[PDB]
Design a binder for this molecule. Structure first.
Ligand SMILES: CCCCCCCCCCCCCCCCCC(=O)OC[C@H](COP(=O)(O)OC[C@H](N)C(=O)O)OC(=O)CCCCCCCCCCCCCCCCC
Ligand SMILES: CCCCCCCCCCCCCCCCCC(=O)OC[C@H](COP(=O)(O)OC[C@H](N)C(=O)O)OC(=O)CCCCCCCCCCCCCCCCC
Ligand SMILES: CCCCCCCCCCCCCCCCCC(=O)OC[C@H](COP(=O)(O)OC[C@H](N)C(=O)O)OC(=O)CCCCCCCCCCCCCCCCC
Ligand SMILES: CCCCCCCCCCCCCCCCCC(=O)OC[C@H](COP(=O)(O)OC[C@H](N)C(=O)O)OC(=O)CCCCCCCCCCCCCCCCC
Ligand SMILES: CCCCCC/C=C\CCCCCCCC(=O)OC[C@H](COP(=O)(O)OCCN)OC(=O)CCCCCCC/C=C\CCCCCCCC
Ligand SMILES: CCCCCC/C=C\CCCCCCCC(=O)OC[C@H](COP(=O)(O)OCCN)OC(=O)CCCCCCC/C=C\CCCCCCCC
Ligand SMILES: [Ca+2]
Ligand SMILES: [Ca+2]
Lengths: 380, 380
């Protein structure tokens, strides 16, 4: 347990010695294009170190609060870079991304995915599943893990299913304002919504039930029994300390209902601007930046979701929202503003009439539900 | 007291609305040289806002913890910029400072100040004080305020006087390794050390005694009596909540003595690298950057000095040093490394023999004092 309360002046000394050595004893190259990137990277690294060693501890502790402090600092850095990218012109921002990786900044080609439907197709005699084969890509294994983590983040069945359904309706309405969207109805539902609910959401709820019926008693690593107990402790150190499963009961007040609606809206906007950011900044879907963003968003979303539940469930008259939820909301707003700024012509396309009627019907149905809620509250 | 517990989501909404307006509804200029500076400034402003609204509260509260959070964030930004400047070449760093202000990046002329001594000089019959007149500049009014604040920061007589004396000896030894240093012996002592001890240090100790014999009882701004009480409360709101005067007793152990020596060394290095930074980065002494650095260092030094006293005086087995002291130490180390890197040829000049003998005598005297301390501890 030495590392769990280790000193910070030792970290300061190590950092100072390392940077002093690498700056003085080495030879500085005579080109500014490399030294500028080196300085930016060094500043980012030092900020990460200082935050890891001196930031606040979040609600999550295991495996080490330094992990969540590191992710908080990464969130801060990402927000700063997002704002810097926002405040420039579009082509200069794309060239800045080209500075990040020397392959971006060029118009990538566009292709359609849902061009082939009717799985039982006699077009290709050799393979009946010729239409399915192209669909069976890394997306399907990604959906299971993604929704497993996203249902570990929010810890509710109804909220999770409503978020998934709302996002799928939004994706269908999003098809003509972003041409890469092309999915058949079977691929839309059976391949995505069916798979998520059947496997990812179900496994997340099973994990919550399994690890919410456990006794959390821990002791030292050297007081445990022989190698069997050693391996048991090593494996279980990455299991959570103790959680409180969230219970979002929205039909009890008005502010609580609006707060649940707001967090649902933020969750939807996260995925919306994820897709629109991978589109408008001219980054390929398989670029490592997108995967890094996904991992960071998974971790930061879990922490911020716990923090916003803690803020929402408090009985005290005035509580300040945790910094992680604030940072996630700021990042989402900045990403949405970037998306609106960079490509407004493609985003401003008018909705299809036949789906706009359905959207209006849903809106009026929600309004009727709200007024009926008010009526029943008045009666009671 | 509305602002003392006001909401943070309101701040987030205001920031998001203002940045979205200034980015979208305005027209982005078609030059990257202005947009890059605009983006950097916007990122700095957003980081300042987020830190002010969501950082940790330091030991100092009055007039508002937001003030000290703002100074902590400024410290973070200054450290990051210092490291970025460090990791480049010397000429590129000077041109970066030229980017900060379009007049820097040029070799400024060098002049001597202590070229005229012997105040009672019959060289100029018209004015006997012709030598004094050039000396009587803004430096003397600056010394009083500077040492008043610096003795409010450390809250001790002996430590303050020893720091002043050590810094003056260091300045005298620093004359040939930095040519701008030129002061006559009277200007060295009577004009600086005499004035500080007579006025600044004495007024600081008088203020500490006066405001350490006060009863700190406060109430609301609307429960006070009429306009007399209103003005009294308005004036006294900027008076401190309640302080605990530090008492540095170094002759009790060895770790405590070494800690006092370390904080004295950091205090000396702060002024050393202040002068060497204003010299080596080609900034004129009267540039606003130097004054901003002085103000920031005054505030951050006070906060970090309280934090390091709190860390040093704790009885608990393990306490983490406050972030402000960590940041001040990091900034001092980074500034010293920049000074060593940029102009090593001027700094590496061999010290004068006649003063090197005095320095060796002082060092051996300190060693004898330490061994006598060990001898007396062994006897007792
Ligand atoms: C030996 C095997 C090494 C691998 C391993 O997982 O060790 C597990 C060790 C041991 O737990 P602990 O720190 O003593 O518990 C601290 C204290 N009792 C507490 O829970 O509070 O603790 C850890 O190893 C924790 C993993 C740290 C991961 C760092 C960031 C990821
Ligand atoms: C390096 C790889 C490690 C990746 C994460 C490992 C991990 O299990 O973190 C699990 C994290 C942290 O949970 P906690 O600190 O115990 O706090 C629980 C809090 N009370 C709560 O309400 O949640 O909280 C979670 O992310 C919950 C996921 C549990 C999955 C366990 C299987
Ligand atoms: C009316 C005159 C305005 C000028 C002025 O100084 O008002 C003074 C006001 C009034 O103190 P308070 O906030 O009610 O005290 C909070 C609480 N009772 C507490 O001490 O805890 O409080 C203040 O005005 C404090 C000055 C804030 C300065 C902001 C950064 C500098
Ligand atoms: C805007 C202009 C305001 C400039 C600073 C005003 C000011 O008086 O800050 C005074 C600051 C902070 O005082 P505090 O919150 O009470 O902390 C007391 C702490 N417990 C301590 O031991 O200090 O602490 C100090 O800097 C002490 C200076 C006192 C001078 C009063 C005359
Ligand atoms: C921290 C708690 C959650 C995680 C628990 C364990 C933490 C460590 C696990 C790390 C494992 C890395 C996972 C690798 C990434 C991965 O598997 O895929 C990422 C998956 C797969 O991508 P998909 O979008 O599903 O596929 C697109 C199909 N067209 O992506 C995702 O998970 C998306 C996550 C979105 C997160 C949204 C964040 C917003 C959450 C809350 C904010 C809401 C409200 C709070 C804010 C403000 C309140 C006022
Ligand atoms: C916060 C507590 C202290 C201030 C109290 C009130 C705060 C608000 C007051 C703001 C007023 C602004 C003052 C304007 C600036 C001013 O008057 O002059 C600045 C003066 C005048 O300049 P001089 O160097 O004296 O003249 C040169 C002569 N050759 O400059 C200074 O005050 C120098 C201050 C140096 C401070 C050093 C900081 C380091 C302190 C502690 C760190 C040490 C240990 C902790 C770190 C690590 C521990 C392991
Ligand atoms: Ca889909
Ligand atoms: Ca002097």
């Amino acid at each position: 347990t030495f590392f769990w309360r280790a000193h910070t002046l030792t970290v300061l000394f190590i950092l100072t010695c390392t940077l002093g050595y690498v700056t003085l004893l080495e030879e500085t190259p005579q080109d500014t294009a490399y030294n500028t990137k080196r300085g930016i990277v060094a500043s980012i690294l030092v900020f990460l170190c200082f935050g890891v060693t001196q930031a606040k501890d979040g609600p999550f502790s295991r495996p080490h609060p330094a992990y969540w402090r590191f992710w908080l600092c990464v969130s801060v850095v990402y927000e700063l870079f997002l704002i810097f990218i926002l405040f420039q012109t579009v082509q200069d921002g794309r060239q800045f991304l080209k500075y990040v990786d020397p392959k971006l900044g060029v118009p990538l080609p566009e292709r359609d995915y849902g061009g082939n439907c009717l799985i039982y197709d006699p077009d290709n005699e050799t393979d009946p599943f010729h239409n399915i084969w192209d669909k069976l890509d890394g997306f399907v294994p990604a959906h299971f893990l993604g929704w497993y983590l996203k249902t570990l983040m929010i810890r509710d069945w109804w909220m999770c299913m409503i978020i998934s359904v709302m996002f799928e309706f939004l994706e269908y309405s999003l098809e003509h304002q972003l041409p890469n969207f092309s999915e058949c109805w079977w691929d839309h539902w059976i391949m995505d919504v069916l798979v998520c609910n059947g496997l990812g959401i179900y496994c997340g709820m099973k994990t919550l039930e399994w690890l919410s019926l456990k006794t959390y008693k821990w002791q030292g690593l050297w007081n445990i029994p022989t190698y069997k107990g050693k391996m048991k402790r090593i494996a279980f150190q990455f299991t959570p300390y103790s959680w409180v499963r969230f219970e979002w009961k929205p039909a009890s007040s008005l502010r609580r209902w609006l707060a649940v609606c707001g967090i649902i809206l933020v969750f939807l906007l996260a995925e919306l601007n994820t897709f629109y950011l991978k589109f408008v900044l001219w980054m390929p879907p398989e670029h490592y930046l997108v995967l890094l963003r996904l991992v960071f968003f998974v971790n930061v979303g879990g922490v911020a979701m716990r923090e916003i539940y803690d803020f929402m469930d408090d009985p005290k008259p005035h509580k300040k929202l945790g910094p992680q939820a604030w940072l996630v909301a700021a990042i989402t707003a900045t990403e949405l503003l970037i998306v609106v700024k960079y490509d407004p012509h493609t985003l401003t396309l008018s909705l299809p009439f036949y789906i706009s009627q359905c959207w209006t019907l849903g809106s009026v149905l929600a309004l009727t539900w709200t007024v009926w809620r008010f009526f029943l509250r008045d009666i009671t």
